[PDB]
Amino acid sequence: PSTNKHLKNNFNSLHNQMRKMPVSHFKEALDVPDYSGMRQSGFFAMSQGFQLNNHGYDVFIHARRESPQSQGKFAGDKFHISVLRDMVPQAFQALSGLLFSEDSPVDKWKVTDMEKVVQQARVSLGAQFTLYIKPDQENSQYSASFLHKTRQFIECLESRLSENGVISGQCPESDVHPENWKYLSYRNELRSGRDGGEMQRQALREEPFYRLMTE
Numbered sequence: 614p615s616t617n618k619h620l621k622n623n624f625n626s627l628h629n630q631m632r633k634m635p636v637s638h639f640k641e642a643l644d645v646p647d648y649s650g651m652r653q654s655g656f657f658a659m660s661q662g663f664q665l666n667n668h669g670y671d672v673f674i675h676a677r678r679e680s681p682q683s684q685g686k687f688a689g690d691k692f693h694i695s696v697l698r699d700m701v702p703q704a705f706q707a708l709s710g711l712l713f714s715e716d717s718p719v720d721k722w723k724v725t726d727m728e729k730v731v732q733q734a735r736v737s738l739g740a741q742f743t744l745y746i747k748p749d750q751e752n753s754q755y756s757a758s759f760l761h762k763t764r765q766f767i768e769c770l771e772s773r774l775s776e777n778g779v780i781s782g783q784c785p786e787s788d789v790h791p792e793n794w795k796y797l798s799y800r801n802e803l804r805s806g807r808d809g810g811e812m813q814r815q816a817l818r819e820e821p822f823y824r825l826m827t828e
Contacts, residue, residue, distance in 0.1 A: 616688035617804070619754040620821035628825055630757035637765035639717065641710030648702035652726055661713040672730050673723040673743075676712070681720040683759075685748030689803030690822050692746070692767060694796050695739035695782030696774065701727050704741075704796075707777040708770055718762045721745040739783035740798070746822075755822075764826050767797055786810075789817040791827045799823050 620627065642661045646654070651674045654665035659679075667674040696704040705724055712722060725741040744767075749759035774796050781795045787805065788798035804820060805813040817823060 616685070616748050616753050616755065617821065620825070624821050624825075627755070627757050627760060628828070631761040631764065631825065634758065634761045637716075637762050637769075639711055639714045639766065639769060642713040642715070643710065645709045645713045647709070648705040648724075651705065651724060652728065661715070663713055667726060672726050672736070674726055675723045676721065678720045681747075682718070683720050683747040683749045684751040685753035685755075687745065687747045688753065688822075689801040690746040691800050692744040693740035693785060693788055693798045693800060694742035694744070694770065694774075695784050695798065696741060696796055697780035697782050698727070698732065698737050698741075700779050700782075701725070701741050703777065704774060704779050707773050707779065708742075711766065711769060711773065716762075718746075718749075718759060718766055719744045720747060735783065735785065740785050740788070741782065760825055767794075767826065771795060771797055787813060789814045789823065794827075799826065 645660050651665065652667055654667045654674055656666060656668070658665040662680065663676045663678050665674060665676050711717060712719070722742065722744045725736060727737060727741070730736045746763060748755045750756055771794060779796070784790060784798045785800070788800045790798040799817060801817065801820060801822070804816065806816055
């Protein structure tokens with residue numbers, strides 16, 4: 614019994630429920646830091662109910678909702694966002710309304726502090742944002758309405774970035790994405806395996822969470 618077993622046995626039901634739901638609306642927040650503001654979070658800062666920090670021993674600014682909306686145990690599902698290195702601040706600002714939204718399905722996320730990482734390293738070239746996804750229900754099963762909201766949210770991120778003319782970054786080797794995601798990619802370290810390369814990606818693509826996000 615597990616998050617994935619539920620997705621597998623309810624694969625068509627979840628998809629069918631999702632595709633019939635009306636468009637999600639996310640009320641964007643305005644009183645949020647810009648990218649430099651984010652970097653300056655230091656030991657602790659607060660914005661729109663998300664706890665922020667940029668500790669000296671790490672290279673990401675972390676954001677976590679004080680009162681999480683998902684009650685389930687993390688099942689490994691996460692998204693990266695990859696944009697052109699020089700465009701990370703612009704991209705953060707463009708997405709900040711959504712990422713701090715009272716309506717966001719993402720309780721926890723982080724953005725790389727570009728100043729702390731070497732310009733030629735892959736960490737600078739892509740995956741500068743991470744979004745952690747957690748099953749919404751206490752029994753650690755995803756509900757159809759939560760899956761829909763997560764998918765709508767990710768697609769809103771894609772449209773905001775493209776509408777702002779943000780240039781895509783370099784997607785991590787370990788991630789997968791469909792042709793219509795220019796910035797978003799999916800990873801699950803719990804289900805990817807020991808083989809790396811093409812084999813990890815093929816395994817990711819068969820993941821019901823990923824198929825529900827993309828088909």
